[PDB]
Design a protein around this ligand. Structure first.
Ligand SMILES: *[C@@H]1O[C@H](CO)[C@@H](O)[C@H](O)[C@H]1NC(C)=O
Ligand SMILES: *[C@@H]1O[C@H](CO)[C@@H](O)[C@H](O)[C@H]1NC(C)=O
Ligand SMILES: *[C@@H]1O[C@H](CO)[C@@H](O)[C@H](O)[C@H]1NC(C)=O
Ligand SMILES: *[C@@H]1O[C@H](CO)[C@@H](O)[C@H](O)[C@H]1NC(C)=O
Ligand SMILES: *[C@@H]1O[C@H](CO)[C@@H](O)[C@H](O)[C@H]1NC(C)=O
Lengths: 99, 99, 50, 49, 148, 50, 30
């Protein structure tokens, strides 16, 4: 449940169109059979997670050095909507206006 | 040549001039233009940061593309001018004031 | 503003000063007009009133 | 190796925030609009070997 | 009101230029055939034409559709280059959409062509008292080639 | 604060940077963008003063 | 040195006020 920030690494100027992708697994060849990698082998229990993205409006809090420490998603729930309405991570009593 | 099938990636390096400071001058930082005086800074940028901001349309720090140095921008001194008069009905003297 | 007389054009490094040598050019060209020339190359006549 | 099985789902909770620009700021709150991963999402998990 | 006028201008860039080569297509121990002139694409190279244009001892150089003095001021992508050797009399008959011998028909340029043409003398490399029979060319050709 | 933030809107022009417009277009074509920007900023100033 | 009464000091401390440089970017002044 912790919070972390993701840095920019590279921006390659390629310009080709991408619509599908596929991962590459480093297969281990248990070279005890004459069928090479087309035969009996063994490896670990690797797995991974893939998620997609959609356009959203986010509120970001910068600390005193310049690293993001907490973010608020605008379209989550009424508290999130109010906290996005006025720039603050804390709100006081009353009645507030939204979309 | 080919005509804009991809982002531009082939052209000259452009000539840089020696760095000067302590007197407010025009500047160009390959993406930043304007006029101001450049002073030594005390903030610490992240390694991948280029230029800082304080509020909308406010640039407060620029990273040197040569030596990775942080410089602070301060606009040239300016202000309105006013004239103090005892009225031409009596005499002709002025006490010009800078604000 | 009109340009009159002629000047020895200098596009190189060393000033030719009338030598007309390397990278040195004469800033003038002469048109070539013939009946067989195309319409796009035809010598039209233009007058401007201000 | 055609032994099939359906995938599994989890929550993203609050991960997936990245610096959108090269701009640096200090002790301020910034509002932006861009592509992100919505919190508490529907994420696939490929444990099939 | 008043303001203090600026007195100077400064422009900054990183020292690293990454000038990936250009000269390898201009100096070489071998040159491509006239009928099969080689074409090479160059990308992500920083142009350095300012010094190669003015001071490189090029007898013939001419740009169409652009001013050489500003060639360093604008950026392109994937610059294409060629290289071959011809005779002294064949340089004049090289032009965009220019007709000549059927050998000249083996190379063409677009009617609306923007670029530059380079041709420098070499009268001591390919010239031999016994003759130059090693390098062969086309003179009786039935087919004409397209621009570039 | 609102007033200053008003300076960061293009008002329907190509960009909100004054020098950028002059640095990428001919003056007879840049004048219309300059006029749009002037109109927008003037209206904002009027609202603030009122 | 700033001769004031005790309650005036409490009043001053209970009200809390660069922005001026941001205005100087645009000619605004105080
Ligand atoms: C910020 O930078 C200072 C040094 O400039 C460092 O001591 C500190 O650990 C950093 N992080 C925070 C949260 O202050
Ligand atoms: C100021 O002007 C009035 C009339 O214009 C005149 O009577 C008066 O003498 C003037 N003041 C002085 C000091 O002379
Ligand atoms: C995400 O959606 C799927 C249905 O598409 C649902 O089964 C799953 O429970 C959701 N995620 C979580 C963490 O509940
Ligand atoms: C720029 O100049 C400095 C000063 O000598 C040098 O150390 C550096 O390698 C040069 N290049 C870059 C990219 O900073
Ligand atoms: C090729 O190398 C020779 C050897 O000095 C040099 O004179 C010539 O300018 C080079 N051609 C280029 C760099 O295009």
């Amino acid at each position: 449940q912790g919070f972390s920030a993701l840095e920019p690494l590279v921006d390659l100027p390629i310009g080709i169109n991408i619509t599908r992708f596929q991962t590459l697994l480093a297969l281990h060849r248990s070279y005890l059979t004459p069928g090479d990698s087309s035969s009996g082998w063994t490896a670990g229990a690797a797995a991974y997670y893939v998620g997609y993205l959609q356009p959203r409006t986010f509120l970001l809090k910068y600390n005193e050095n310049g690293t993001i420490t907490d973010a608020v998603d605008c379209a989550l729930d009424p508290l999130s909507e109010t906290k996005c309405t006025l720039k603050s991570f804390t709100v006081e009593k009353g009645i507030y206006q939204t979309s | 040549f080919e005509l804009l099938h991809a982002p531009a990636t082939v052209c000259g390096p452009k000539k840089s001039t020696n760095l000067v400071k302590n007197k407010c001058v025009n500047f160009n930082f390959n993406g930043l233009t304007g006029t101001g005086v450049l002073t030594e800074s005390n903030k610490k940028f992240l390694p991948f940061q280029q230029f800082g901001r304080d509020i909308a349309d406010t640039t407060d720090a620029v990273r040197d593309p040569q030596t990775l140095e942080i410089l602070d921008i301060t606009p040239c001194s300016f202000g309105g001018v006013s004239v103090i008069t005892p009225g031409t009905n009596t005499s002709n003297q002025v006490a010009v004031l800078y604000q | 503003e009109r340009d009159i007389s002629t000047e020895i054009y200098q596009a190189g490094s060393t000033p030719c000063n009338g030598v007309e040598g390397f990278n040195c050019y004469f800033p003038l060209q002469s048109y070539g007009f013939q009946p067989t020339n195309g319409v796009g190359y035809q010598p039209y006549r233009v007058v401007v009133l201000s | 190796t055609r032994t099939q099985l359906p995938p599994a789902y989890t929550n993203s909770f609050t991960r997936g925030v990245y610096y959108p620009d090269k701009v640096f700021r200090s002790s301020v709150l910034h509002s932006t609009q861009d592509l992100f991963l919505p919190f508490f999402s529907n994420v696939t998990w490929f444990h099939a070997i | 009101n008043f303001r203090v006028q600026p007195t100077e201008s400064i422009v900054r860039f990183p020292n690293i230029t990454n000038l990936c080569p250009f000269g390898e297509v201009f100096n070489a121990t071998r040159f491509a055939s006239v009928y099969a002139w080689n074409r090479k694409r160059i990308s992500n190279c920083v142009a350095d034409y300012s010094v190669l244009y003015n001071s490189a001892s090029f007898s013939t150089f001419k740009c169409y559709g652009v001013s050489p003095t500003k060639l360093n001021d604008l950026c392109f992508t994937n610059v294409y280059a060629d290289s071959f050797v011809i005779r002294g009399d064949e340089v004049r008959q090289i032009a965009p959409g220019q007709t000549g011998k059927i050998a000249d028909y083996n190379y063409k340029l677009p009617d609306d062509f923007t670029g530059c043409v380079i041709a420098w003398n070499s009268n001591n490399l390919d010239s031999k008292v016994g003759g130059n029979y090693n390098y062969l060319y086309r003179l009786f050709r039935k087919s004409n080639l397209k621009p570039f | 604060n609102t007033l200053v933030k008003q300076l960061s809107s293009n008002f329907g022009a190509i960009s909100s940077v004054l020098n950028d417009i002059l640095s990428r277009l001919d003056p007879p074509e840049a004048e219309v963008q300059i006029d749009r920007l002037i109109t927008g900023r003037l209206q904002s100033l009027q609202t603030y003063v009122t | 040195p700033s001769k004031r009464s005790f309650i005036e000091d409490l009043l001053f401390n209970k009200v809390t006020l660069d922005l001026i440089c941001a205005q100087k970017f645009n000619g605004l002044t105080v």
